[PDB]
Write a protein that binds this ligand. Structure first.
Ligand SMILES: *[C@@H]1O[C@H](CO)[C@@H](O[C@@H]2O[C@H](CO)[C@@H](O[C@@H]3O[C@H](CO[C@H]4O[C@H](CO)[C@@H](O)[C@H](O)[C@@H]4O)[C@@H](O)[C@H](O)[C@@H]3O)[C@H](O)[C@H]2NC(C)=O)[C@H](O)[C@H]1NC(C)=O
Ligand SMILES: *[C@@H]1O[C@H](CO)[C@@H](O[C@@H]2O[C@H](CO)[C@@H](O[C@@H]3O[C@H](CO)[C@@H](O)[C@H](O)[C@@H]3O)[C@H](O)[C@H]2NC(C)=O)[C@H](O)[C@H]1NC(C)=O
Ligand code: 2ET
Length: 654
């Protein structure tokens, strides 16, 4: 096919070895800041000692800064707490003598050039959490279940409430937290009170009662609330930060049951609801843009209750695309993909040249299935979960199998450049994989029981590969590290030599491999979501199309750190398919027409009794959240009031 020439020399001077000498136990790695190059490596020993290393070169060289922490012992439970973005804030938690009045931290605002020791008034139960708004604002939970806040980068701490189960930063330095009264968080479960502070503890407002748990995603604030004189509970939603609430359109659940936010974005959430009775699976619902009304997206979605693992995956390299696992009747697992944000799920098309396996009832006809958290947890030979990056358009890389179900065999690696519509076997056998330069470079390391001296790369998005021996002394591979955001040319291969064992890291700079900077000609026009190009609506997803400029497979050049994914939207005519049925409406049959329910049952009937004025009254149709369509069809009909229809059956008092 095609390759890069004289590459060996180009990677020769760019391969940078660093040996880590003393290392043991927990090894944490933290990137600090974007486009800084700062990496922290924290190690701990036990009968012990903590070693701390720093690199400004993206891992090409480190320097032992343990002398900055006074060679004291860092507790790994709390790891390295890194400030948001380029703040440079770094906080480590030291272990203190048993009798100490309070804990102790080592903090740096300088990207760990200098640290300062600070004795705390308390003992941290949790890692310290930075306010996303202001990186000098931190909150922590004490072992006494106190809520402590620092206005200056952990220098001074104030205890704002004395009983707290859970606490979170919202937007604008807001703090949400749950509290208890009588006794342990555990005991008062369901009886918890939900509070909010917007002043950092000057004043509070209790925005919920009978609270079980809460959580944030997108614009939504979710709270689980227990039913009066009952063992069950249900979701309530707030977009006003607790000021007003509304009951969700979801079913209630018992105590063995749970809710989970699978994904949330400014438009909506995917809510997973556990099935009653230890199924190991649930149903996924997608919400409307209020987070109030829930369409039912997927049945028998696999989510384990203990050590809860779900293969649910945002495919971040193309808009609207998500993959996940479902549990079949034959008790086997199948991967499904949605291109529309959960309006439709379907099996993943299999590679043209792939062959079906034993799991498949027909040798000619089967599909592609993806290994993800679940496979991993069951200890199938799976080095990495699925990878995609938003700056690498359409690209998805995953271990998988081709057949009627996820198979237990040793998986090859598969790739897609179109966002999951079509696939190809990228490499045979399990590999660790990473994306550099927004897809300009793909890198892979073989997964082996025995040591490896070799790395593999592709500049054509996985179509052909080349091989580079980065060391004479082969190592046992322990991981890849590369700058978050997939924009660098720099990749770190982590491992240890055969023993007297020690860790080493070989960091490779591809700057010479692609010497040429990409230019306008190197990009070609690509419509995302194309199915039938003769169709006027081809590629409309959620009301609109996007056309991209993508880097040619053939063209090899660096995209650049400043690279901008450029795309243009086309606004499609609204059709009924752009709407979801509103409360008390459903799509019977083939027709996409939303029609009125004859009567509301189950949680529909629950809501209908217990809902509120806005949602109970309806147009029968709402725009799918995030759906940008213009013109064409707007359903025309008058808002009705459904409260009468539910209460219609009940005898009412005077
Ligand atoms: C599945 O993965 C997709 C790819 O990552 C997700 O798409 C991304 O969604 C996020 C959030 O909706 C978008 O984030 C951007 O954030 C910046 C930050 O600016 C500020 O925005 C508001 C202020 O108005 C506030 O939240 C903060 O102050 C932020 O600092 C915005 O300026 C952007 O306009 C945009 O909102 C990404 O743009 C988007 N990526 C792509 C490639 O479209 C998708 O949401 C995921 N699905 C789910 C359900 O989570
Ligand atoms: C691969 O790793 C190397 C480090 O080994 C990274 O080197 C860094 O390169 C950037 C730009 O190429 C340098 O940035 C600087 O930016 C400021 C802002 O204008 C200005 O002083 C200069 O224009 C300068 O270029 C940075 O100093 C440099 N750092 C080191 C230690 O060499 C390189 O960025 C990595 N490659 C990629 C693609 O990320
Ligand atoms: C795996 C798992 C098991 C479980 O029992 O509960 C989970 C929950 C709890 N969800 C809360 C609702 C609230 C947080 C919005 C609730 O169920 O009341 C998760 O959020 C995520 C994962 C689990």
């Amino acid at each position: 096919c095609g390759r890069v020439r004289d590459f060996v020399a180009k990677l020769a001077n760019n391969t940078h070895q660093h040996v880590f000498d003393d290392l043991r136990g927990s090894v944490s790695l933290s990137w600090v800041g974007d486009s800084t190059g700062v990496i922290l490596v924290l190690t701990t020993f036990h009968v012990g000692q903590s070693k701390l290393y720093r690199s400004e070169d993206y891992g090409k060289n480190f320097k032992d800064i343990t002398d900055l922490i006074n060679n004291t012992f860092i507790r790994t439970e709390f790891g390295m707490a890194i400030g948001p973005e380029n703040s440079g804030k770094v906080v480590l938690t030291a272990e203190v003598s048993g009798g100490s009045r309070g804990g102790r931290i080592f903090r740096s605002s300088d990207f760990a050039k200098n640290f300062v020791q600070t004795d705390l008034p308390f003992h941290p139960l949790t890692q310290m959490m930075y306010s996303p708004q202001n990186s000098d604002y931190l909150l922590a939970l004490s072992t006494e279940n106190g809520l402590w806040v620092s206005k200056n980068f952990g220098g001074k701490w104030e205890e704002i409430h004395k009983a707290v189960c859970l606490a979170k930063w919202g937007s604008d330095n807001t703090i949400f937290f749950t509290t208890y009264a009588n006794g342990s968080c555990k005991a008062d479960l369901g009886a918890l009170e939900l509070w909010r502070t917007s002043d950092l503890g000057k004043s509070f407002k209790t925005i919920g009662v009978k609270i079980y748990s809460f959580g944030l995603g997108g614009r939504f604030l979710f709270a689980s609330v227990m039913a009066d004189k009952d063992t069950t509970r249900r979701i309530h939603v707030s977009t006003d930060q607790g000021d007003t609430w509304s009951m969700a359109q979801l079913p209630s659940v018992g105590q063995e049951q749970f809710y989970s936010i699978l994904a949330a974005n400014d438009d909506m959430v995917f809510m997973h609801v556990d099935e009653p009775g230890d199924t190991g699976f649930g149903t996924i619902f997608t919400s409307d843009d209020r987070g109030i009304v829930y369409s039912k997206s997927l049945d028998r979605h696999l989510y384990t209750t203990t050590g809860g693992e779900t293969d649910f995956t945002n495919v971040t390299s193309l808009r609207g695309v998500y993959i996940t696992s479902v549990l079949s009747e034959d008790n086997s697992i199948q991967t499904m993909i949605t291109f529309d944000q959960g309006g439709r799920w379907t099996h993943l098309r299999k590679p043209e040249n792939s062959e079906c396996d034993a799991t498949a009832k027909n040798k000619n006809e089967c599909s592609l299935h993806i290994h993800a958290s679940y496979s991993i947890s069951q200890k199938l030979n799976v080095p990495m979960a699925p990878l995609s990056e938003p700056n690498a358009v359409g690209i998805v890389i995953a271990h998988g199998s081709v057949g009627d179900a996820i198979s237990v065999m040793v998986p090859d690696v598969y790739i897609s450049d179109d966002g999951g519509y079509s696939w190809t076997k990228m490499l045979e056998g399990p590999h660790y994989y990473t994306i550099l330069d927004s897809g300009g470079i793909i890198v892979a390391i073989e997964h082996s029981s025995r040591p490896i001296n070799v790395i593999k790369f592709s500049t054509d998005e996985g179509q052909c590969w080349q091989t580079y021996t980065f060391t004479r002394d082969p190592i046992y591979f322990t991981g890849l590290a590369s700058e978050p955001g997939a924009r660098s040319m720099n990749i770190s291969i982590w491992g240890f030599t055969e023993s007297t064992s020690q860790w080493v890291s070989y960091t490779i700079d591809f700057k010479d491999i692609l010497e040429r900077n990409c230019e306008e000609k190197d990009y070609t026009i690509w419509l995302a979501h194309s199915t039938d190009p003769e169709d006027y609506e081809d590629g409309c997803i959620l009301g609109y199309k996007e056309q991209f400029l993508r880097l040619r497979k053939s063209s090899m050049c660096q995209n650049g750190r400043d690279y901008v994914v450029t795309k243009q939207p086309s606004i499609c005519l609204c059709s009924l398919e752009d709407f979801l049925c509103d409360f008390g409406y459903y799509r019977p049959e083939n027709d996409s027409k939303c029609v009125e329910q004859p009567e509301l049952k189950g949680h529909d009937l629950e809501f209908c009794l217990y809902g509120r004025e806005e949602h109970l009254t309806t147009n029968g149709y709402r725009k799918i959240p995030g759906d940008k369509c213009q013109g064409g069809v707007n359903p025309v009909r008058e808002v009705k009031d459904l409260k009468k229809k539910c209460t219609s059956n009940f005898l009412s008092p005077e």
